[PDB]
From a paper:
Specifically, four different flavin mononucleotide-containing proteins were engineered to undergo covalent flavinylation: a light-oxygen-voltage domain protein, a mini singlet oxygen generator, a nitroreductase, and an old yellow enzyme-type ene reductase. The elucidated crystal structures confirm that the covalent attachment does not significantly perturb the binding and microenvironment of the redox active part of the flavin cofactor.
The isoalloxazine group remains embedded at the same position in the protein. The phosphate group in [name]-F2 is further stabilized by the guanidino group of Arg41. The interaction in [name] with Arg57 is not observed, as in [name]-F2, it has been mutated to Thr57.
Author numbering:
A (entry chain A), B (entry chain B): 2 to 110
């Protein structure tokens, strides 16, 4: 299944309001464990903070970006998360949601 | 002039959407330079990260806080910023804006 989430940047700290079954499977968290949280909950000691701070600034500026960073499953297993973030805008062009796709790393070294 | 800003936590990363003339004067930045930025842009090498972390936790949790931390004017001059951050709620009690007041540090030693 594709792993993706939908966040609402019109709510405080841009929480996840929808998580695909692929995301549950990739992360090992349940839907109850995920919803209402900011995506950074997957991050941990080895995550690159310069990439994180860079993504924060890009997201504030409503840019579409791709980043690759270390995340952790619920049980503490590290994985490379190739994460594509895209604003979704309403009919008038105003930001409504962000879509985050956790892309497969199979052909990514 | 009193120095303050209004941020919008219903836009990603709580950007500054209004800056008082006193804030322009305190920081040396222009209105154009400031709007759309997160307040953290004033921070720099000597800012205390434990205080930053503390503020960030309170803000994400929609709480009122007062902090004191080192900031930098546009030209690189350090000043102590005694910063009071307050949620502003709508008629129903839902978070609408944050007000951040940069209080005068004259009688704060």
């Amino acid at each position: 299944e594709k792993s993706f989430v939908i966040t609402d940047p019109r709510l405080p700290d841009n929480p996840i309001i929808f998580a695909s079954d692929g995301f549950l499977e990739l992360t090992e968290y349940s839907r109850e464990e995920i919803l209402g949280r900011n995506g950074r909950f997957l991050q941990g000691p080895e995550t690159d903070q310069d990439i994180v701070s860079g993504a924060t600034d890009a997201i504030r500026d409503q840019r579409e970006i791709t980043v690759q960073l270390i995340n952790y499953t619920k049980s503490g297993k590290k994985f490379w998360n190739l994460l594509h973030l895209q604003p979704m805008r309403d009919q008038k062009g105003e930001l409504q949601y962000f879509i985050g796709v956790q892309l497969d790393g199979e052909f990514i070294p």
